[PDB]
Amino acid sequence: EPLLVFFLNPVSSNMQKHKKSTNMLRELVLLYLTKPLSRSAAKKFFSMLISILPPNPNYQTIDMVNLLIDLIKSHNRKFKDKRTYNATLKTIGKWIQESGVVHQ
Amino acid sequence: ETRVNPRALEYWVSGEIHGLVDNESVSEFKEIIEGGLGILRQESEDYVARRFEVYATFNNIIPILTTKNVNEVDQKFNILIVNIESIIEICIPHLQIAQDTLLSSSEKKNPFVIRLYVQIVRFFSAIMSNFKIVKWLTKRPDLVNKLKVIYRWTTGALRNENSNKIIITAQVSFLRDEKFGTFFLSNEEIKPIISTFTEIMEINSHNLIYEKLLLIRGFLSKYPKLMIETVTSWLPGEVLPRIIIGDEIYSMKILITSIVVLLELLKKCLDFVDEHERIYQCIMLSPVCETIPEKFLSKLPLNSYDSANLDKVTIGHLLTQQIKNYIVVKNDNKIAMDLWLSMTGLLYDSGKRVYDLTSESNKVWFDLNNLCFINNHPKTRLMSIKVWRIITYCICTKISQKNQEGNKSLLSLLRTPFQMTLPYVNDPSAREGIIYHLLGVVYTAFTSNKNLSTDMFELFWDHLITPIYEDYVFKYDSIHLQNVLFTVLHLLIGGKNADVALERKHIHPMSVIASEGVKLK
DNA sequence: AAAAAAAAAAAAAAAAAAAAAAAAAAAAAA
DNA sequence: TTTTTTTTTTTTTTTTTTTTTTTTTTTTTT
């Protein structure tokens, strides 16, 4: 629910809203996965968190998505998945970045 | 350019071409199916070879349940419920000629017809197992009774000719997934099916026993009244020998699956009590050669005079021996006790057999529990008390006041866990087993027993609660244990200060059979 | 004139949601 | 150093509540 709002709040612009949002959206996920990566979660949360990536329009929203997607991709190199959903964990880059190089 | 054609001869080449691309999630899948049914219209110069491929692709463009969209299933199967009259004029005879050419000889491992026969059986299985087809069939019973011929031939195709490992597995997976009979076969139309469970062509390739035991599950939960009336056949003939022969002739998967079938019958047979007394008759009264077929006895690890006196070895003896090796050799303490449980309940639910618990020939079952309880593992020590839930249920539901000293003897044996745990009161798990047991006693004798009168209560009091509390409870220095053991008294008199239901309420005797058992609430 | 339509007013079938039950996988103890 | 069990998830089946049909009975055409 709140991650849906983290996308569309720039419909009414206000860089004062963005300037606090991107800072808090980093610290939200910093502790979401404090325990050493459940195998099932690497497919369960992974599947619904990609079922709604648009708007494909909205220039000042995609700024926020490109700034957060490589913060995730940073820990996906450090202490990811101790085997299991390796393959699907990199398909996150294949369709998300397809958006970020079609509307930017 | 789209020109593959849905009909004629152009689509299926002579070995492949299916259509799992743009017809996945799309209605147009229709013309591959309704196409193939048009190709089955006899003729049989070019169309005979191509009979192998049409029943292959039918097992490929069919969906699974797909929770993501249960409607793609609904809409793909909505073509079949319209085409069905055509499936019945051709696919039934095309199966029958493939079956009967496979039911005329012995050398018949012919890869044309036998590779087709399995593919046409899968095609019917996926039609029957679809529940929406089952609700729809009630609209026309003419078709129900035409379709009913599948079982009338399948029941011969298990116990006759050269029924191969693959032919059996395809027919058993069909009967496991079928669902159809519950709304379209009478109880007597089903007895010809159960009649085959004992009579199968022998090849204990593990594959085949695994699916055979899983069929018994589906049949117990969808056909309980029918399975119980016939238990004297399929249990001793083909399930019960699987455990006794041991792990070595099999694989642990097989042994565990034949233990689960015992628990399922228990969750569907106390409903009917077995007033026919089949249990004690075919197992503890009867020896080996009265109920076990030679088919399994030649494979059996016999030992001494027992091999020459199969007339005297009642099935309960040889079962009791095999349970003894699990604890003392393997350390398989859970498998030994969960098995042991299921037999004692079924055997003694009969309202006269409850008293057989007092007999010295039967106390070897308590000794067997004691040999588990002397082991190190606190979880094993708790579990060897967690099992006593059945001993409460039999002694406190199916009891008859008339046998005054019989009741008194059962009520004395029922305190045996407290005698075992008395030196072990230091241990956490040994304290907890006292509470779990005692909740089940109280619940079953007073809360779920409606028939308390005056007379039952007197047995449950100065012959039971007083001997519990004076001889065990008033001797434990464990104050937090005593706090809980006295709380159950407040509940029974009128102060129900024990949460009852905040958020996160047992009343029928089955409730004590559960893994959590019963609570103060 | 007799049979057919028109309208009260009870009656019968079945899908949803949550508890248990039970499974996968994850948390614990070697 | 790897075996064993518990929370999250799945499925059955109640228990409510709704959908729905079929009997009942006046006034005109078979």
Swiss-Prot record, chain A:
Subcellular localization(s) per the UniProt record: Nucleus; Chromosome, Telomere
Family: Belongs to the RIF1 family.
Known role: Negatively regulates telomere length by preventing telomere elongation or promoting degradation of the telomere ends. Recruited to telomeres by interaction with the C-terminus of RAP1, which binds directly to telomeric repeat DNA. This may create a negative feedback loop in which the addition of new telomere repeats creates binding sites for inhibitors of telomere length extension. May also influence the balance of transcriptional silencing at telomeres and the silent mating type locus HMR, which is mediated by SIR (Silent Information Regulator) proteins including SIR3 and SIR4.
The protein's assembly and partners: Interacts with RAP1 (via C-terminus). Interacts with RIF2.
Name under which the protein is recorded: Telomere length regulator protein RIF1
Species of the source: Saccharomyces cerevisiae (strain ATCC 204508 / S288c) (Baker's yeast)
Gene coding for it: RIF1
Parent-record interval covered: 1169 to 1272 of 1916
